[PDB]
Amino acid sequence: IYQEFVNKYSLSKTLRFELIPQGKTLENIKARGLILDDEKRAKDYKKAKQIIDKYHQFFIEEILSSVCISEDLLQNYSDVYFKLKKSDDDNLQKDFKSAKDTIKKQISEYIKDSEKFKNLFNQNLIDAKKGQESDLILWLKQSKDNGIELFKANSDITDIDEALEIIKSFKGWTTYFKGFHENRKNVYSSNDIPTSIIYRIVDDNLPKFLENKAKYESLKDKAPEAINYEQIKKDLAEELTFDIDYKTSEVNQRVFSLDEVFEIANFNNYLNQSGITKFNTIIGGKFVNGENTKRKGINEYINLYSQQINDKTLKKYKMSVLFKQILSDTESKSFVIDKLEDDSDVVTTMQSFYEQIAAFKTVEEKSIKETLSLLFDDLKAQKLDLSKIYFKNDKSLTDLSQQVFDDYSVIGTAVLEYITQQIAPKNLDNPSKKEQELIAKKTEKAKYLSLETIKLALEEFNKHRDIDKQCRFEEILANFAAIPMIFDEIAQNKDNLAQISIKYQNQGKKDLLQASAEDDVKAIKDLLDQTNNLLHKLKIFHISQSEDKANILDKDEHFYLVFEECYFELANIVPLYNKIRNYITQKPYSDEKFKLNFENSTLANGWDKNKEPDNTAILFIKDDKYYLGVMNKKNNKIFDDKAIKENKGEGYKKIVYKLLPGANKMLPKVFFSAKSIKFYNPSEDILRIRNHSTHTKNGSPQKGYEKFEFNIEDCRKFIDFYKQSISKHPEWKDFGFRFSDTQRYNSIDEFYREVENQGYKLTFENISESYIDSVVNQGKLYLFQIYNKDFSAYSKGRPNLHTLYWKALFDERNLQDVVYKLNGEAELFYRKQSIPKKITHPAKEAIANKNKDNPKKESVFEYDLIKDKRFTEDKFFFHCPITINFKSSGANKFNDEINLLLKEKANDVHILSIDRGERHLAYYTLVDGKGNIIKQDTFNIIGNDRMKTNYHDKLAAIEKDRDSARKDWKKINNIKEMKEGYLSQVVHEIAKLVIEYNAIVVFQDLNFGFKRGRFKVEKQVYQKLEKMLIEKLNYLVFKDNEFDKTGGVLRAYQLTAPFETFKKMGKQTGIIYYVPAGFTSKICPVTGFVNQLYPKYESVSKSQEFFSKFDKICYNLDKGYFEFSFDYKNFGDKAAKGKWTIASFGSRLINFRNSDKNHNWDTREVYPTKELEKLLKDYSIEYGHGECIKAAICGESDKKFFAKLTSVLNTILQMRNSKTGTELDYLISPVADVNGNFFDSRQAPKNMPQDADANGAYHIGLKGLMLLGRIKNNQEGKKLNLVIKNEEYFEFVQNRNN
RNA sequence: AAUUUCUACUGUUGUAGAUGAGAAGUCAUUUAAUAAGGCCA
DNA sequence: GGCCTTATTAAATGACTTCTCTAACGAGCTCG
DNA sequence: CGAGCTCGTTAGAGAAGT
Ligand SMILES: [Mg+2]
Ligand SMILES: [Mg+2]
Ligand SMILES: [Mg+2]
Ligand SMILES: [Mg+2]
């Protein structure tokens, strides 16, 4: 089993705890004000990360725009990029790695050739030194305040007179930023990290520009349509300026053209953010002010030719927009809307609109309401001619169809039955071989279908109706007579909300977005949608000024000096509905769990004894209780070597901590020091090895020297030379190494570990209890208690894991050989109060339970039970890192150790396998090493202890609440915590099965192209069961198992590779194999049949060729069902060997019919056998003899016959069915090669799948079962072939039992 | 309806499982409004 | 009355990929 | 005008890898 597989690689956690202020430390903290001046150092510290990240926005516009013109190296990259995608053994990446790095070393040459890069990451930024004004407060002071710039106009920072004060108040707090200046050494890294601006250009925006021009010279090919470069280039001209061409020299302000935009030499203008919001506006498009329509772009002009002209494959020249530049305040060029700030807008902006609608009198003396009851009433008495009245055949007409007529296809199929008889004769002049498109035939797409073409065409529509009183023109004509009644539903609903537009008329309230207004937003929202939906019923008469070539439609008489004057006021629900929707939908700002300083920039950066007057944080132990003492700033030497001797008594075991961090960085820090090199005495040759870097393979040389070779002829150099004195330091003589010895020791990596593996000492020194209480009462120590609900007295049973780790830091089983090394840089926090004090369950009165299996219905409870006591209290927290498996950290070549484990521990290893999705969120199936499954249950109902709750319906209830919250502007409730708490039940249920049944759990692949658009489902546990199973078998401790035994707390299970990324993961994360998607669910389990046919009814003549390919299509005399018994060798794409005998004995099912419109409303049911006997009754083909009846089927040609028999073959092949109840939708197998009795999974035994989704996990665990067959026979061909192609997969499934 | 935190609980000032935190950056998605379009037994 | 496409804007959530898990020396400093 | 003092800084291996 997995029992020799503990202590494999180091890890890290962060144990959280509460800190209870003991004694009068809470009296001392709140006396000075060490929390009231600490929410002013996380609210006034994130301001100084928005001032330093705005000096990086006047350095990232100088490292990419003003310099960095990487010319003609681009073509050397582009030649080896497109060539690389075809085929590559080992050569095409040699030039590709060279062409990648050579572009980077010109971007990262202005890294080390600028003045603003050394004085950017240290003290010289904020406050440099006495006598020097520092480069960030110099950049802000004279260049901005005395210059002309106001660039703090978009923040919570007011101006720049105030923004110097945030920076200057961190004087002395420069090492507080040492984790922020390591996130700005990542923006400029010349390495393969995605935070870098040299990865954003070379590995994001450049290959997304090579394929962005390879899909444009293939767009001049195959498609020269009317893309914008015919006349329409007044639109995208302000974003085609490009003040310097990069095929030639400078050109002042000429408008570029699309030929010299996708030139490879002009990528060097697509570097900064001002030239990516000037390239995505090419591809995307933009809106303007005083607009009529949209200014389109190349990925929109391809849409209007792809679908509008033909049936298409031109969608796949969809050109990507380029990713933004790191740290960049992006621009739009697309009219961002003037978003509002508080609640005094939403009841004044919304209030001033309906003041202007209901109380507007024109210069022609009318109102908006009494000129649709007066002007659309003139449509009844025909006072206006019905030919200058125009609909708009895009959607407002077809929306008017199934609003008046209860059918969409009335006005559509009444001009269809009018254009074929009136404007066209019965001569049938070119029906198909003509235009039939938007140019000559569809003259009403962009143009306006007249009501004169509706008046005497609906009158012609009723000439062939069934009943007499049917749909005709005066029902359309009287709807718009009833449209100014919605004018009276608004402005009476607005007078209805006169009492809730006054409970929010106060500036800066910001309360409509609270959940206390969740039922009053509903009154504000549904007053907008009585105006939004009103102005989709006047979007039928709208003349959009997009005038075509002299095709001015004649329409003037009292219908557009009237309608477009009153539609012009009511069209302001573009700037009313979105200034409000974007304000309500935002979450309200919760309070912060800010970080505790106690006036110390290095608070608990280290626990070491030598640094405690600098760190000021000590740990204690008193009777299995743990204590956090934080010394005062002023009184920091109150635990020195003197005060422990004068107070050595009985009580708090104070913790003595010894640490040697970074033996690469530390042993040549003190030995080769510029203070005490004379004491360690390096020889004449050691002092140049640290210069020439001979002791390293790839280590840096000291300045002014050159890297020599590690192991040319001196691999045995450092053994007898570079090993001098660790046992001469005053403190560090505690090690006892496994010294070099010329035979027993490799390179300098294996010494700097054995320093750090042994450079950790934890010892205990008693302090008398009367002294600790004396400094706490005085003000010289802030003692807290590290409290975790298992350190309480009432802890009956098993504790947590983040308690059973913390007890195991300070143990004595631990410190014999350290597994649980405590770390530094721990954080202290203070979460304020969130939930109010409402008791809701008072004393001693009974409370009804929530379990029907529970042999109890009430509970007494002498004490109260407030709702959330976590959040009714102002708490102190303590995030504390650990470094589990400390002296073992080999995290490399992990997966070959498992593939050598499973090569020996085969025939005893089972295959867990999980299907994600919606019908089952997960579905394990413990398939053993022969196929015959053992356990099988959904992970929908989980928690087998005493509850058995159903999270599949809990998560679906959040989806239907989240999606309702988005569409009702309610608060979107976070589904990730319910899903984290659901999966914790699953993972533990997995983790028990991994050890009890020896699993090698295998998922479906789900390439990231799938799961991006599978985020439509919100209950789906894609990416999330696997990420919470890799990091949960990285360290798998069993609370039942004995402390220091195999799966215990010291020795715990490590069964995944260390989770670095998914990118360098592949298809083996330890034991978490992946298998690729497709053809897992649709397979008969007992035989192995698949859906390798695809009838679609393309033509009629080749349909005769389709049903001639079968071997025989016969009725069975002996039993009574049809057969389509064939072989697949006589078919097109990929022949799978096997003679299939598919049948129609099983009664198949649901075909997904459609009631009024399409896309999966309802279901059906049809039997296959009794559907084609009807078809052998409609035609003269008989079947009583029982032989080959193939030739009779191919003879009788019909439009009906070969469009129906394929649609029955698209139903016998449909195996996943069995709706109408949605109760474990089973499978029917056609072939059944065993005895002819089919596989119907309702009547399935224990060791077969039970529904359709149990057949996915039976085959994810079956293509993942031949992974375990390769590994069982794997050898010196170490190229581990985990990728499978379904040519042997289909071979292995079918030939299983044999 | 009690938690370092989350989920389910009453298991009785708690019970069972899980818990890698901080910071920075980006990306993906959903919904809505808008724009131009396509299709339907 | 539905479904889908290409975009743009705004709001949300979810989730990826990087850095760190540090004691000791040396300026730089106030003080004498 | 050197005493320590005290915070910003400095020291700077090594291996696998859609
Ligand atoms: Mg440039
Ligand atoms: Mg316990
Ligand atoms: Mg527990
Ligand atoms: Mg709960």
Short mmCIF file of N, CA and C in Angstrom, two decimals, chain A residues 184 207 294 316 344 452 486 550 611 637 796 812 873 890 1129:
data_model
loop_
_atom_site.label_atom_id
_atom_site.label_comp_id
_atom_site.label_asym_id
_atom_site.label_seq_id
_atom_site.Cartn_x
_atom_site.Cartn_y
_atom_site.Cartn_z
N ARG A 184 6.68 44.15 -7.22
CA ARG A 184 7.08 45.06 -8.27
C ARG A 184 8.45 44.74 -8.81
N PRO A 207 2.45 36.22 -29.81
CA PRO A 207 1.82 35.13 -30.57
C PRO A 207 0.33 35.33 -30.78
N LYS A 294 -23.24 51.59 -34.01
CA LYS A 294 -21.90 51.28 -33.56
C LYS A 294 -20.90 51.46 -34.68
N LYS A 316 -14.16 31.09 -37.79
CA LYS A 316 -12.87 30.73 -37.22
C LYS A 316 -11.71 31.58 -37.73
N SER A 344 -28.15 59.63 -3.20
CA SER A 344 -28.78 60.89 -3.53
C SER A 344 -28.81 61.15 -5.03
N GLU A 452 -48.06 49.22 -45.70
CA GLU A 452 -48.81 48.99 -46.93
C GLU A 452 -48.55 47.59 -47.46
N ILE A 486 -49.72 52.31 -21.05
CA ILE A 486 -48.52 52.08 -20.26
C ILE A 486 -47.91 53.42 -19.85
N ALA A 550 -28.63 56.59 -51.32
CA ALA A 550 -29.78 57.34 -51.87
C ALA A 550 -31.09 56.57 -51.74
N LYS A 611 16.94 38.35 17.52
CA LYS A 611 16.17 39.38 16.84
C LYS A 611 14.94 39.81 17.62
N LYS A 637 13.66 45.10 25.51
CA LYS A 637 14.74 44.30 26.08
C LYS A 637 14.35 43.74 27.44
N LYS A 796 -14.52 17.52 24.00
CA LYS A 796 -14.72 16.10 24.26
C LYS A 796 -13.90 15.23 23.32
N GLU A 812 7.63 16.94 21.94
CA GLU A 812 8.94 16.33 22.10
C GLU A 812 9.12 15.12 21.20
N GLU A 873 -18.17 39.77 17.81
CA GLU A 873 -17.07 40.05 18.72
C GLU A 873 -15.90 40.64 17.94
N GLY A 890 12.71 16.97 -1.02
CA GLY A 890 12.89 16.61 -2.41
C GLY A 890 11.57 16.53 -3.15
N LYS A 1129 -16.39 -1.30 -41.59
CA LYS A 1129 -15.32 -1.14 -42.57
C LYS A 1129 -15.77 -0.43 -43.84
#
